[PDB]
């Protein structure tokens, strides 16, 4: 009722395994990829650490078959862009290898709800999404939810208040272009306008700004997506409906026409997206949106299928 | 640096005690009271069970020795309200115990934090405050931290989101007359008056007080629910964790109150106490009900025989 | 599924009921008695707490309906000759057992009523249960509580000291001192009297109850311990009062402690000891005295 | 504060692994990452820090500078090279010891109180070094050893029985890998030997299984992590919560079965803020005491070649 499969062995993929199998988020894990070797070799250095916990179940194979009956799905894999590729070659490049991975997946798993986290994640999602043939709900990507809960831990660093008490979100497009939602951050039920406690724009910029350094001094990242991935992992197979900023079906909310995927606060529970939480966006911010969307649905608009 | 002293017991200080030590809030714990065969008998049982928590020294004991060098003490002894009894009858039975018990503990722990948990908590924590001689920061009573706990569910409950997202306080005179803050209420950042979901309002905060009430008429006593709050109060305080919970704390200064009493307000909590005040901008009507309740509060204690 | 059912919200029951609920054994618990207000009471004292966790349901009733489906239940409603405080907790158990029986017909029952033994036995016989899905709390606590009194003497962690009471609970229960071991070394070979431990786990048991009238903290928890091993499929072991005929030569139908592998299915299995001559004599000693109390029950 | 404070040494595979599995499991709320590689240590400090909010508060610094990991509780030392194809076992030790020699005398210049965990390969070997090469009392040196084989022996044991891992007991000792001792003589299942075992649910198998599938997991990937990460996280807690708890650890040999070579080799040692409080005594049959006899004079010889 828990069995959690992870698409792709690299960096990103066994963080998130080790993330959920050691925070206890499932004991039954599938592990996909097409490298033989790499696959049997991971199975095997976590089945011998899984010696120190109790009814851990771990499958790896290059065979999708391994994966039947996942109640999630999280699709990691993917190609990094080339020197003087565009963007819409990444992502149909992207695309292709996702062509072979999503209906096998949707195959041995019908009733599985999907985590993208392969860059870039919003359009990718959209993309899984079309491929999967699954319900709009089922289809979610990792989007700015690890970038929403920096921002929190950094406001809330600032105050000297937890985190708990330091409340928004970063929606729309993975990166740069994300939107703090300033309009609803809140400390305790109190506006950020309104403190009386014992500028603020620099702490995005600061969350986005990390996220890229990150890659250019250690190659790539993995840890924060890694625990972004089983959190969010742990809030469906739990049945939390706790909100998540994550990439999600956005046509129709803001007065958004394109079909594209950009993140928002979304109640996410066994069933998927039960909800997308609806932010009284100020005009800036809705606007950033609307054209993360245009642009996102342009570049769609050329995807081969 | 995380020793606890509980005071009292009883079904409130036992569920906070078996709490902490079952949550893990703290390794050494006193108990203190006037009962020497029933403080050695649950010191036993507590212990007979050694192997099923995490390694803990446990005292106690009728001498307040034994509560030496406490970061907190939870103060739960105290009477339980008679058939008829008035408001002031109860207030002055509670106060004749507390002045047995707040200066020895103070004694013992110069430097500790009194939280209250006895009824009616905001005047005893008051009564406490001005027995113990310690800073207005360091003497808090439990309030209405379990009433927001449980207002913030009953939200959760009826929109299908997580307690998590759900966020709102309610302050003042813990009872019939607290406040729910409205205007501070927010689901995942959007107020009341913005809501647009998928899954009226007054009759939650209504049900949080009437709710509490029933419980203490069916079996006597409240005992589970305020233990868990404690055992989190206790929790942010030790881990110096800066979290905010509504908790009776002093509140001349705050809202233009010029009454030296107290009152529920989230406060943000520390290996100091009271580290802060969250200052919520009221509504009229939130800020004259807490006036008024401040008012009543400050005519009650000028009864009460020091 | 994880219900789990309290049968009695007595100082045990309710122990239990919050160990399970904050120690996270389950999300759902159902209790049941017989006084409807101090049900109701009880009922809403936890859900307020609740308000603290993450999706719990409790629901109390006088109806047994309320247990409907449950994959445990635990008994601990009783009473306060020793033949004669048997026969008024077998009434008891008369009208208890077979109502959880019919509500839960594939759920495992726990008996915490003492005397343990026997009432697990009547339990047992009155449920038409096999005998594979009704234990009880045996000598679980005082095993345990045995195992860190040896930790704290050696100065070494529990967890690498082992060992078994088993038998009847109580004065009469058997240390299994052939098995006691500290990482692997029996005690007679320690290169690093001890009766005293077990006399003690044993006598402090009932200095409790003279002291504050009952006990509860210390059962709630060893309850809830057997819950999670039962509800999570651990296949730990745990000395539990347990069908005692055809181990150890033991011929009569009785229940006793042995060291029980416990998971989804009940008993799995029972661990069986190399008891010496002594060890298991006094075994034998208290089958044959159980086998004759219970000649004498009336059901 | 730093009553708690861990330094890892080396961000490769193993390190980071170790350093992921204290936080996220609260052993330590105080980390200090060191190694030569400065961009390596800035991404991998930005990258623990991206993901602050999803675990407790902690305190981590990165630095080529040693100075970051003054006042250690414990260090980690998982620095080291990889066995190339062919390379002698003299060879591997002695580059292995190269860079122990700048490692370990700036760990004690900055933490002289600290307890050393060395995770390195071949670990009993380099224990031994590291000992030396510190100062240090031989009680505060430890080796990964067989901790992790311990337990792996253990589960499968509980595998094959149906019976979890919690009642099933016993130790590898002795040296790392193929010639480590499985001490058949001390299993026992809920304080059963195996000899008398008589339930529902080709023993010496499983020693096999353990060693070959520990060499199969460097074959396959090159190296291995989560599982010495978990294994590291298990010492690292036991040490500084005092737990007293008993772990098969590469231990200061001499004087124990009999032994007279000044080695280092696994025992299950009994563990907590000093270090090796005590060694836990095994009645050890005659097939037990040989191989760990000659694994310790097989090491004595070892030592001998190594330039110090």
Redesign the interface.
Known sequence: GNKVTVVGVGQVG??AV??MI??GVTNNIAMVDVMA??L???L???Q?????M??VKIQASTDYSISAGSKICVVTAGVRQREGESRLDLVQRNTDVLKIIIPQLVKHSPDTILIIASNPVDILTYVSWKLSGLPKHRVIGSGTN?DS??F??LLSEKL??????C???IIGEHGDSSVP?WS???????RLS?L???NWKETHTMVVK??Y???????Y????????L??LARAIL??????HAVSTYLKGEHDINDEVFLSL?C?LGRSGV??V????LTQTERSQLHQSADLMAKVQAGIKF
């Open positions: 066994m963080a080790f993330s050691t925070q070797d790499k049997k070799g991971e095997m250095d976590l011998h650490g899984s010696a120190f109790r009814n690890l809960a920096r929190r831990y000297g208040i937890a985190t708990t008490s409340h928004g979100y939602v609803g951050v809140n400390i305790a039920g109190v309104d009386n406690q014992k990390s996220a350094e990150v890659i250019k001094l250690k190659g990242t993995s840890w924060a997506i890694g625990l972004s089983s959190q739990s049945n939390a409906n706790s909100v606060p109640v039960c909800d939480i609806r932010q009284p």
